[PDB]
């Protein structure tokens, strides 16, 4: 048997070797227990002639990890392993590779296709020295290898199916693609991801420094009017982002209902549904070219067709009513609530015959459909109970449609001045307004909470208001150089420059402050992030209005009246930030950006940093990670138990036997047991009450999952009626059950 070297050289299949290499990874670890012939027996097994060392070296720490139920200290060789096979693939020289990109020739077309973008070449070329030296490849194995596996998939680009591109590689790419001829900004910016501070989206990531960059790849559009024309421009548009990999909110509320009369073709018309199907199959062929493009609808709840959309995405039915390539949304007035809750009627209608419902929130609104209500303009009348139940019955069955607060959403926004919002995104966190000529664009970072605990358990309040001054600066200039597959984004991004900061590790934060999720001390905590996120970002926005002038549609802007979010929700902030002072400076010179701060899923990039999603508490303390698959347990818990001595075999065979849950297990002392709590065991009215707390310092919305175990039509109601009584944006984005 023979492995192959790097160097494309044969070698004899030795055990002795093998586990030599794996001998002197052993440092520190426990031998009693680690035995680096037991991996080496376990790879030599399932071994086949042909196979290279990094597949080996692949084979050998997926081999270590599954010896973690034998000893912890095998998980922590399992990723010694992946590193040092790291740090050997990340050419050495960060401009080399550069022009092994931008010289790439694909191999059946015989055509000169550039990985990387001339110009960014170039701005390489002419600072070569200062960039490869800045480089800290050491700073490679500080991931885990679930975040290497994530990177080396998608996020490395590749030549000819190898990857060409260290991490580190990557992270300069983007930073050059960023900052372009501002090499200190472009240095500064490599740092802070490199040592892991905060991460720009996977769009960045994939495509910064690359031709006609797409930076940005959230997008949100409304339904231009009612027509076959409008219907068709827009999904022209769809097609068009979806293209260019953007995921999409779209408004379709402004579409005449089923049965409503056509005066153009005496005919009457097939309302939502049929149109739909044809958004569903337009997302299912343009999905980049062999793999679908993702597109939310957003439909208000006074529309005629509201039952049926509600069954859109029920797996039994009848395909012709189906659209399940879709996601749901509902773009909810106050009225509808105030109207189930008190058990009156509700009034189905046509916006045909009720036109401009979707164009007016709050009193306007109100005022408006009631009275269509007592002109008679009305289709059909149900119990507003009646409908409340279809809703929650859609989310038993499919975990959707979305919840969003359209009066809350506008009353709150600093966009307020352009117009009614009629919609969010793919994801529920963006607040952004759209018209014919607007369609709004997501640009999106966020900040590792978990890098800003110190080793006394304090945090460093400081450090988070500086990272997110230079995330501020860095999507900014994202807004610029940015590639817009429609102008009508463009033409949004430019005149209100909107951003959105967003957040990942959360819950380690509490975790490594030794907070519970629901204590009064992460309660506070999570006030004093959100307040700093808040507070740096509007300082770092008016230091750009003053170098640069303010966005076009600053003027008339609540924050131009001296209004900031946490006005809107009536919220006096705490004494850690004087906002009268910055309140001073945003008189002076205004803000650079209508929005900056909304909280998105992290899915992927998280992942990579190896935090937990979002702003969310850990779903369970033990967990699969597919790559085959891996078991995972809570890596602060799994710390605590074997520094503890409480840590064996069976202790974790129990606490799957418990479904991810430490509570019941009599060892755990209770400190331990409700730090490690999971959101099974939390409240979920107090992830919506700390939501709506961070809430009053987020200028557009967060993506807020809820998880009930047993789900009934008593629990649903409860908590989104909590949730929206907490003034919430989002009330739920997906419903999480077991």
Same mark, same amino acid.
């Given at each position: 048997?023979?492995?192959?070297?790097?160097?494309?050289?044969?070698?004899?299949?030795?055990?002795?070797?093998?586990?030599?290499?794996?001998?002197?990874?052993?440092?520190?670890?426990?031998?009693?227990?680690?035995?680096?012939?037991?991996?080496?027996?376990?790879?030599?097994?399932?071994?086949?002639?042909?196979?290279?060392?990094?597949?080996?070296?692949?084979?050998?720490?997926?081999?270590?990890?599954?010896?973690?139920?034998?000893?912890?200290?095998?998980?922590?060789?399992?990723?010694?392993?992946?590193?040092?096979?790291?740090?050997?693939?990340?050419?050495?020289?960060?401009?080399?590779?550069?022009?092994?990109?931008?010289?790439?020739?694909?191999?059946?077309?015989?055509?000169?296709?550039?990985?990387?973008?001339?110009?960014?070449?170039?701005?390489?070329?002419?600072?070569?020295?200062?960039?490869?030296?800045?480089?800290?490849?050491?700073?490679?194995?500080?991931?885990?290898?679930?975040?290497?596996?994530?990177?080396?998939?998608?996020?490395?680009?590749?030549?000819?199916?190898?990857?060409?591109?260290?991490?580190?590689?990557?992270?300069?790419?983007?930073?050059?693609?960023?900052?372009?001829?501002?090499?200190?900004?472009?240095?500064?910016?490599?740092?802070?991801?490199?040592?892991?501070?905060?991460?720009?989206?996977?769009?960045?990531?994939?495509?910064?420094?690359?031709?006609?960059?797409?930076?940005?790849?959230?997008?949100?559009?409304?339904?231009?009017?009612?027509?076959?024309?409008?219907?068709?421009?827009?999904?022209?548009?769809?097609?068009?982002?979806?293209?260019?990999?953007?995921?999409?909110?779209?408004?379709?509320?402004?579409?005449?209902?089923?049965?409503?009369?056509?005066?153009?073709?005496?005919?009457?018309?097939?309302?939502?549904?049929?149109?739909?199907?044809?958004?569903?199959?337009?997302?299912?062929?343009?999905?980049?070219?062999?793999?679908?493009?993702?597109?939310?609808?957003?439909?208000?709840?006074?529309?005629?067709?509201?039952?049926?959309?509600?069954?859109?995405?029920?797996?039994?039915?009848?395909?012709?009513?189906?659209?399940?390539?879709?996601?749901?949304?509902?773009?909810?007035?106050?009225?509808?609530?105030?109207?189930?809750?008190?058990?009156?009627?509700?009034?189905?209608?046509?916006?045909?015959?009720?036109?401009?419902?979707?164009?007016?929130?709050?009193?306007?609104?109100?005022?408006?459909?009631?009275?269509?209500?007592?002109?008679?303009?009305?289709?059909?009348?149900?119990?507003?109970?009646?409908?409340?139940?279809?809703?929650?019955?859609?989310?038993?069955?499919?975990?959707?449609? $979305?919840?969003?607060? %359209?009066?809350?959403?506008?009353? *709150?926004?600093?966009?307020? #001045? !352009?117009?009614? @919002?009629?919609?969010? +995104?793919?994801?529920?966190?963006?607040?952004?307004?759209?018209?014919?000529?607007?369609?709004?664009?997501?640009?999106?970072?966020?900040?590792?909470?978990?890098?800003?605990?110190?080793?006394?358990?304090? $945090?460093?309040?400081? %450090?988070?208001?500086?990272?997110? *001054?230079?995330?501020?600066? #860095? !999507?900014?200039? @994202?807004?610029?150089? +940015?590639?817009?597959?429609?102008?009508?984004?463009?033409?949004?991004?430019?005149?209100?420059?909107?951003?959105?900061?967003?957040?990942?590790?959360?819950?380690?934060?509490?975790?490594?402050?030794?907070?519970?999720?629901?204590?009064?001390?992460?309660?506070?905590?999570?006030?004093?992030?959100?307040?700093?996120?808040?507070?740096?970002?509007?300082?770092?926005?008016?230091?750009?209005?003053?170098?640069?002038?303010?966005?076009?549609?600053?003027?008339?802007?609540?924050?131009?009246?001296?209004?900031?979010?946490?006005?809107?929700?009536?919220?006096?902030?705490?004494?850690?930030?004087?906002?009268?002072?910055?309140?001073?400076?945003?008189?002076?010179?205004?803000?650079?950006?209508?929005?900056?701060?909304?909280?998105?899923?992290?899915?992927?990039?998280?992942?990579?940093?190896?935090?937990?999603?979002?702003?969310?508490?850990?779903?369970?303390?033990?967990?699969?990670?597919?790559?085959?698959?891996?078991?995972?347990?809570?890596?602060?818990?799994?710390?605590?138990?074997?520094?503890?001595?409480?840590?064996?075999?069976?202790?974790?065979?129990?606490?799957?036997?418990?479904?991810?849950?430490?509570?019941?297990?009599?060892?755990?002392?209770?400190?331990?047991?409700?730090?490690?709590?999971?959101?099974?065991?939390?409240?979920?009215?107090?992830?919506?009450?700390?939501?709506?707390?961070?809430?009053?310092?987020?200028?557009?919305?967060?993506?807020?999952?809820?998880?009930?175990?047993?789900?009934?039509?008593?629990?649903?109601?409860?908590?989104?009626?909590?949730?929206?009584?907490?003034?919430?944006?989002?009330?739920?984005?997906?419903?999480?059950?077991?």
């Amino acid at each position: 048997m023979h492995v192959i070297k790097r160097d494309g050289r044969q070698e004899r299949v030795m055990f002795d070797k093998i586990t030599s290499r794996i001998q002197k990874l052993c440092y520190g670890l426990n031998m009693d227990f680690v035995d680096p012939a037991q991996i080496t027996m376990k790879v030599i097994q399932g071994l086949y002639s042909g196979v290279t060392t990094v597949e080996l070296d692949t084979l050998a720490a997926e081999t270590a990890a599954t010896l973690t139920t034998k000893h912890p200290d095998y998980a922590i060789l399992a990723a010694r392993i992946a590193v040092s096979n790291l740090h050997k693939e990340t050419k050495k020289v960060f401009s080399d590779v550069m022009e092994d990109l931008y010289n790439y020739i694909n191999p059946h077309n015989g055509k000169h296709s550039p990985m990387v973008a001339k110009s960014t070449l170039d701005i390489v070329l002419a600072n070569k020295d200062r960039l490869n030296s800045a480089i800290i490849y050491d700073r490679d194995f500080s991931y885990n290898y679930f975040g290497f596996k994530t990177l080396e998939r998608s996020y490395l680009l590749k030549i000819n199916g190898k990857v060409a591109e260290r991490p580190q590689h990557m992270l300069m790419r983007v930073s050059v693609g960023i900052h372009k001829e501002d090499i200190d900004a472009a240095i500064e910016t490599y740092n802070l991801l490199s040592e892991r501070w905060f991460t720009h989206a996977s769009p960045t990531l994939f495509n910064a420094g690359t031709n006609r960059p797409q930076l940005s790849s959230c997008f949100l559009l409304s339904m231009k009017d009612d027509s076959i024309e409008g219907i068709y421009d827009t999904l022209k548009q769809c097609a068009l982002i979806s293209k260019s990999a953007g995921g999409i909110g779209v408004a379709v509320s402004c579409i005449r209902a089923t049965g409503s009369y056509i005066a153009g073709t005496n005919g009457n018309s097939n309302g939502l549904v049929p149109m739909l199907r044809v958004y569903n199959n337009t997302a299912r062929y343009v999905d980049q070219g062999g793999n679908p493009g993702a597109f939310a609808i957003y439909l208000e709840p006074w529309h005629l067709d509201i039952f049926e959309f509600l069954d859109l995405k029920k797996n039994t039915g009848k395909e012709e009513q189906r659209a399940r390539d879709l996601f749901f949304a509902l773009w909810i007035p106050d009225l509808f609530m105030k109207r189930v809750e008190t058990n009156q009627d509700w009034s189905l209608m046509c916006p045909n015959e009720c036109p401009g419902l979707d164009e007016v929130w709050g009193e306007e609104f109100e005022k408006l459909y009631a009275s269509y209500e007592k002109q008679g303009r009305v289709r059909k009348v149900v119990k507003a109970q009646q409908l409340w139940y279809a809703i929650i019955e859609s989310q038993t069955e499919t975990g959707t449609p $979305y919840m969003l607060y %359209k009066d809350s959403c506008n009353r *709150k926004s600093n966009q307020q #001045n !352009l117009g009614t @919002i009629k919609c969010s +995104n793919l994801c529920t966190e963006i607040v952004e307004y759209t018209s014919k000529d607007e369609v709004a664009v997501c640009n999106l970072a966020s900040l590792a909470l978990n890098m800003y605990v110190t080793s006394e358990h304090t $945090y460093d309040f400081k %450090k988070l208001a500086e990272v997110t *001054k230079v995330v501020v600066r #860095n !999507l900014n200039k @994202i807004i610029d150089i +940015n590639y817009y597959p429609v102008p009508e984004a463009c033409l949004s991004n430019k005149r209100h420059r909107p951003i959105g900061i967003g957040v990942q590790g959360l819950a380690d934060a509490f975790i490594l402050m030794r907070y519970p999720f629901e204590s009064a001390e992460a309660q506070l905590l999570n006030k004093q992030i959100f307040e700093t996120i808040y507070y740096g970002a509007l300082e770092a926005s008016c230091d750009l209005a003053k170098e640069q002038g303010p966005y076009e549609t600053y003027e008339g802007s609540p924050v131009s009246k001296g209004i900031l979010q946490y006005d809107m929700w009536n919220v006096t902030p705490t004494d850690l930030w004087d906002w009268k002072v910055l309140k001073e400076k945003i008189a002076k010179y205004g803000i650079r950006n209508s929005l900056l701060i909304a909280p998105m899923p992290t899915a992927s990039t998280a992942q990579i940093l190896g935090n937990n999603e979002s702003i969310e508490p850990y779903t369970s303390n033990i967990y699969t990670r597919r790559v085959g698959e891996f078991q995972i347990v809570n890596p602060h818990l799994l710390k605590d138990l074997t520094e503890r001595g409480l840590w064996h075999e069976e202790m974790k065979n129990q606490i799957i036997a418990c479904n991810g849950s430490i509570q019941s297990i009599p060892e755990i002392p209770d400190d331990l047991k409700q730090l490690y709590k999971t959101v099974w065991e939390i409240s979920q009215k107090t992830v919506l009450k700390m939501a709506a707390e961070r809430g009053a310092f987020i200028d557009q919305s967060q993506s807020l999952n809820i998880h009930i175990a047993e789900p009934n039509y008593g629990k649903l109601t409860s908590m989104h009626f909590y949730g929206w009584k907490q003034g919430l944006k989002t009330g739920m984005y997906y419903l999480r059950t077991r």
